[PDB]
Amino acid sequence: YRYTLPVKAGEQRLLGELTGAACATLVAEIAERHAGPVVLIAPDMQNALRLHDEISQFTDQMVMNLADWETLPYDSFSPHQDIISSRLSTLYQLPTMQRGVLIVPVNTLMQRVCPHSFLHGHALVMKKGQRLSRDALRTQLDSAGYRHVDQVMEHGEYATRGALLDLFPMGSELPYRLDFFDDEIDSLRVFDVDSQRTLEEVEAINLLPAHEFPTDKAAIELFRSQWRDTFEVKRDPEHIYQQVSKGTLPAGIEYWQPLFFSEPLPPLFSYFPANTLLVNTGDLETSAERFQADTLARFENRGVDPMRPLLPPQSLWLRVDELFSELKNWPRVQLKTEHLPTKAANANLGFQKLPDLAVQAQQKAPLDALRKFLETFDGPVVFSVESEGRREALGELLARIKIAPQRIMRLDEASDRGRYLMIGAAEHGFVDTVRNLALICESDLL
Ligand SMILES: [Co+2]
C-alpha cells in the first residue's frame, strides 16, 4: 500500500487525489486493513447515506449508520419509532464492536447521547422455560417505557391478550409472542405484525428501553426537579412539565432529554472502543461550524413559547471546539479530492476522472466515446450497475460491441485486461492510475 494507517491519538493521515466512488473503495480497504472498528464521519446526512450503500459494495464487513433522529433541533415532533429502535441497537453494540464501519454524519456526531450505562441498566433478557409471569413482565415493560396497546404494530409496544404477551422490542427487527404456563415462559415466537400470525420459535430475546431516556416514576421525579432548577412552570395542561408529570410524553420531548438524567449527556465518543480508527470526508470544520450555527438559530427562533421553554444547545450538542478536542484522542484518516503536496502525513492515491464517455443515443456515432476508451485502456474495466436485473440493460448492450463482462463481487478479482460487471450503488466511476483499473458507473455513460 502507498500509505500506512495512523495509530496514535490525534495522528492524521491525508489521502488525496480521490474522485467519485474511490472514497467508498478506500473506506472499505481501511476497514479491512485496520484490526478494530472504523468510524466514518461524513459532512452531512446526504453523503452519509450515499457512503453507506457505496462502501457496502466493496466490502463484506458490516456497514452501519448511526441513524440521526431526523427531526430539526427543538422540533415540535418526535422521531420515527424505527429510527429510535435502530439508534438504540447501534449505540448498545458500539462499545464491543470489533470490526466494520460505523458511519456518523457531523450533525449526529456533535449531538450528545444517553450514556451506555443507561441502555444496559434498563435492558431485559428472557429465555424459554425461565420463571416469568405475564403480570411480572408487564410491570417491567411499563417502567422501561413500553406502550400498552391492544395490538402490537410498532417498536416500543406490548399487548396483554389472555395468556399471551406480544411485544416489539426496541433494537429488534421483529416482534415476539410469549406464552405463559405456570409463571414461566412456555415459548417465544417471532410473529408478523400485518397478519398477526405466529412464525418461528426462538430461544431468547433482549429488549432495550423504549426511549433514549428513562420514563419511570423516579425519572419523572428527577425531570420535575431538574425542570424547576432550570425553568418556570405554568398551570396550563399543555405545559411540558404538566404533561410529563401525568405520565404523558409530549411530541418533541426528545429535546429535553438531558432533564431525565442526573448527569450531563456524554459525547458519542464515550462509546467508541479504544482501538477505533476515524476516517472522514469533506471539510469537518466548516460542516461543524455550519451545524453549530444552525443549532443556535433553532434555539433563538423557537425559544419564545411559554409552554415549551428550551434547554441551551450545550446541553444536547458539542461545541465545535469541544468536537475537535474529542477528535484529538483518535487517529484519523482524512480523505481529500484534491491533489496534495508532499508532506509527512500526505499520500496521493492516483484516481482521476473518467474521460467524456457520454452517449449520443440518437444514433450517429453513438458509443464512439465508450468504444475508443475500451480499446485504449489496457487494465481491467469494471462496469457498475445498481440492480441484478439492469446488469443486462447494460450487459445485453455490451454484447453488441463484443464485450461480455465476467461478473465478480470483489475488485481484487479483476485481473489483467478483463471486462467486468459489479452490482451496487456506486454513483460515479474513476480511473485508478496506480492499479491501472477503471470503474464505470451507469451515470458516467448517461
Ligand atoms: Co504532485
Swiss-Prot record:
It is found in: Cytoplasm. Consists of a compact arrangement of structured domains linked by long, flexible linkers. The N-terminal region interacts with UvrA, the central region interacts with RNAP, and the C-terminal DNA translocase region possesses ATPase activity. Activity is regulated by a conformational switch from a dormant closed state to an active open state upon substrate binding. Couples transcription and DNA repair by recognizing RNA polymerase (RNAP) stalled at DNA lesions. Mediates ATP-dependent release of RNAP and its truncated transcript from the DNA, and recruitment of nucleotide excision repair machinery to the damaged site. Can also dissociate RNAP that is blocked by low concentration of nucleoside triphosphates or by physical obstruction, such as bound proteins. In addition, can rescue arrested complexes by promoting forward translocation. Has ATPase activity, which is required for removal of stalled RNAP, but seems to lack helicase activity. In the N-terminal section; belongs to the UvrB family. In the C-terminal section; belongs to the helicase family. RecG subfamily. Monomer. Interacts with UvrA and RNAP. This is Transcription-repair-coupling factor. It comes from Escherichia coli (strain K12). The chain holds residues 5 to 450 of 1148 of the full protein.
